[PDB]
């Protein structure tokens, strides 16, 4: 009857389940704690069947979807309680999306065979503008300006959003009711990316004021502010530990932040075409690093504005491996449009051969934690799946999924099924314009919606 | 030969946008063609950046006539879409100009790119 007895009961029931499932028992228990050890332990890329993937694109009403966040309950071995907030939410998978229309919307994705199903939503508007005009008085319940990011707490109790209102609003998962509003207290403290520490209430916020903020959601309080980036911090990623990584965009420095040590590691690409062409004896100078994801505690990957995907190791400041023009080159502008001269050849000279051709940029780049595979996104019209070599010194193209059409603002992955047989569902937010701004020329075929594809493992 | 000429390489474009993107932060940047036309006649512009992929390119070829008549350096760059990202505005920019201020915190950076630009021309 005592709580320790309850744990003894749950542990006893847990073992009986493992015995029913079945060496194998010992290996699984080690796999249960493999997360604590900072090394990849999910080698399932070769098992994935991309060709047979059931791809599906779900349209929605929102214009210009900006980000999507997914919540997956996980059984805690350490107390035998699922991360579901309540009994009703046992084994229910939720996805939260934000767009430039000032809506937060949640969907149910538990049924992988079925499409996401809307549950609740909240709109912001001009009603929520602050009258005071003071940063510290910017505590209105709702958004009034573009929402850019959304992150769901690992506990499944709260979801946090931020955007061009310079706010961090945390919402109740069940009802999408506002419980707290935390101003950044800066003129240019523009939230650009949010990352939750895995299985923790710690939140890391990357702000365009050139700073990173750290938060504890369970306390509704600000912890620390991080400096060192020489430009806007567009992306941030976090894992079970506290060493979150960030990228500086035009600063071109992928940055790892050791919170426990208050020390920081600097990573720079430092590639230049001239030698690269010489060693070859279209390669574009790197533009900015606009996405980052941590494959492992000791490794991470980045995406750039020359179409280059770079693999990184904590030991080495320089990239260990790189793929150039991963998503290809943009279509060349039409000759009938480049110039108004009727003579076709005159119009062709304005194309200047292939000098004008530029590469796609890596709008989205997500890696499943502690796995050998990750997914890259752009507006090329296809999601590319890559597999990292066992030595983690190179990666190759596993395949592609052409279902999505439009700019991939964010990518998420959720899995279901037994441990041995797991079927992966990839969810990617699709928009008609880039999340940060409207620079993109309207790409034919783009639709603002959530892309969904189901992948299963065999052999 | 091409109307959009001279066009900066992958490298020289790099330092240019770095000047542009910072200059926006310092309120030293006038963005877009009509502002480019604005600054040239008032003679407050260091040099002018033009996108070579502009639709149509001739919409901005008037600026070099103004620029070189006033002996102001100018240049073309491949992608308008990148310039707006540097410029900090949420839309593409086809033309941009850096205004004159000897008291700017970046006089050395601007003059550095300016010198390279003159050699390119």
């Amino acid at each position: 009857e005592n709580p320790a007895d309850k744990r003894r009961r749950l542990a006893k029931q847990y073992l009986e389940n493992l015995k029913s499932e079945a060496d194998i028992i010992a290996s699984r228990l080690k796999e249960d704690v493999a997360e604590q050890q900072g090394r990849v332990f999910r080698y399932f890329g070769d098992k994935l069947l991309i060709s047979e993937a059931k791809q599906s694109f779900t349209r929605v009403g929102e214009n210009n979807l900006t980000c999507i966040s997914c919540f997956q309950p996980v059984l805690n071995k350490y107390t035998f309680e699922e991360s579901s907030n309540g009994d009703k939410n046992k084994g229910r998978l939720f996805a939260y999306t934000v767009s430039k229309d000032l809506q937060l919307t949640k969907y149910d994705i538990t049924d992988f065979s079925k499409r996401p199903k809307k549950l609740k939503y909240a709109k912001g508007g001009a009603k929520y503008i602050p009258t005071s005009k003071h940063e510290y008085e910017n505590t209105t319940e709702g958004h009034y300006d573009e929402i850019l990011t959304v992150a769901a707490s690992p506990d499944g109790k709260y979801v946090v959003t931020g955007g061009r209102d310079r706010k961090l609003i945390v919402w109740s998962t069940e009802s999408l009711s506002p419980v707290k509003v935390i101003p950044t207290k800066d003129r240019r403290g523009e939230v650009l990316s949010l990352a939750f520490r895995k299985n923790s209430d710690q939140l890391y916020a990357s702000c365009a004021d050139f700073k990173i903020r750290t938060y504890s959601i369970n306390q509704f309080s600000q912890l620390e502010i991080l400096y060192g980036h020489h430009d806007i911090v567009e992306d941030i990623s976090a894992l079970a530990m506290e060493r979150c990584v960030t990228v500086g965009a035009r600063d071109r420095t992928a940055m790892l932040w050791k919170i426990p040590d208050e020390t920081r590691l600097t990573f720079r690409g430092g590639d230049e075409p001239q030698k690269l062409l010489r060693r070859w004896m279209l390669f574009f100078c790197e533009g900015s690093i606009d996405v980052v994801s941590m494959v492992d505690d000791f490794h991470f990957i980045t995406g750039s504005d020359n179409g280059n995907i770079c693999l990184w190791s904590l030991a080495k400041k320089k990239p260990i491996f790189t793929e150039r023009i991963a998503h290809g080159i943009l279509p060349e502008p039409s000759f009938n449009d480049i110039s108004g001269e009727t003579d076709e050849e005159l119009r062709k000279r304005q194309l200047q051969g292939k000098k004008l051709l530029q590469p796609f940029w890596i709008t989205s780049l997500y890696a499943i934690p502690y796995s050998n595979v990750f997914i890259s996104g752009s507006w090329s019209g296809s999601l590319k799946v890559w597999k990292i070599s066992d030595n983690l010194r190179s990666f190759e193209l596993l395949g592609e999924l052409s279902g999505a059409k439009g700019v991939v603002t964010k990518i998420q992955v959720v899995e279901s099924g037994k441990h041995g047989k797991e079927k992966f569902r990839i969810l990617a937010s699709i928009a008609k314009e880039h999340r940060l701004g409207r620079w993109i020329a309207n790409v034919s075929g783009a639709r603002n919606g959530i892309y969904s594809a189901v992948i299963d493992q065999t052999g | 030969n091409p109307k959009a000429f001279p066009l900066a390489d992958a490298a020289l474009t790099q330092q240019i946008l770095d000047v542009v993107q910072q200059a926006a932060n310092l309120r030293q940047l006038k963005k877009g063609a009509n502002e480019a036309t604005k600054t040239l006649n008032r003679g407050i512009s260091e040099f002018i950046i033009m996108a070579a992929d502009c639709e149509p390119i001739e919409i901005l070829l008037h600026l070099p006539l103004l620029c070189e008549d006033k002996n102001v350096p100018y240049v073309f760059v491949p992608s308008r879409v990148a310039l707006g990202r540097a410029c900090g505005v949420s839309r593409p920019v086809i033309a941009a100009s850096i205004t004159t201020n000897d008291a700017s915190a970046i006089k050395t950076q601007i003059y550095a790119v300016k010198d390279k630009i003159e050699t390119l021309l």
Partner: peptide, 23 residues
């Protein structure tokens, strides 16, 4: 343009027509 065409003028006028209706 050494030998200008009217293709752009047509669409540019069309853009004005859309604005005219909007206001």
């Amino acid at each position: 343009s050494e030998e200008p065409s009217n293709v752009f003028g047509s669409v540019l006028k069309k853009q004005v027509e859309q604005r005219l209706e909007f206001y």
